[PDB]
Structure 1
Amino acid sequence: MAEIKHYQFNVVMTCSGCSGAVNKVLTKLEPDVSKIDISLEKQLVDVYTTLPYDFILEKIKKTGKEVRSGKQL
């Protein structure tokens, strides 16, 4: 318990107001998320955390944007 895992999601994103919404949702999780980094051109989001993977998929699903892929590294 408490070992950091790495996750990467490819997500459909039009605006800088889309990545700025994703950043605002994920900011709530920094007490257990150690890095958040978004690449709009690559259409992807990088996460490093001890939180469970399906809880991030479900916070993305509440953000409401469509997901091209999700994986662990």
Structure 2
Amino acid sequence: PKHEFSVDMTCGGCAEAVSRVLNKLGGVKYDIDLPNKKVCIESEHSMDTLLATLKKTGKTVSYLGL
């Protein structure tokens, strides 16, 4: 499935932090829209796991749906 999340990223370092947590999780194809504070993830990970992973950055995260 393809999931979209809102992630409260401020700048380049925030975009890097999101990339780092997702790279560590593995098994993800993602793209990060820093200006619009959005992250899109194609994966067979559960939405739960992806939400928990993004939250490791400490940024506010919510789910924008499939």
TM-score by length of 2: 0.87
Name which one, 1 or 2, has greater alpha-carbon Rg: 1
Identical residues among aligned pairs (%): 44
Q: Which runs of 5+ in 2 are unaligned?
A: none
Q: State the number of aligned residues.
A: 66
Q: Which runs of 5+ in 1 are unaligned?
A: none
Question: Structure 1 segments of 4 or more deviating over 2 A?
Answer: none
Measured on the aligned residues, the alpha-carbon RMSD in Å equals: 1.3
> Can you list the C-alpha shifts for 1:6-42, whole angstroms capped at 9, x where unaligned?
1011111111000011101101233x22x21001111
What is residue 27 of structure 1 aligned with on the other side? 23
TM-score by length of 1: 0.79
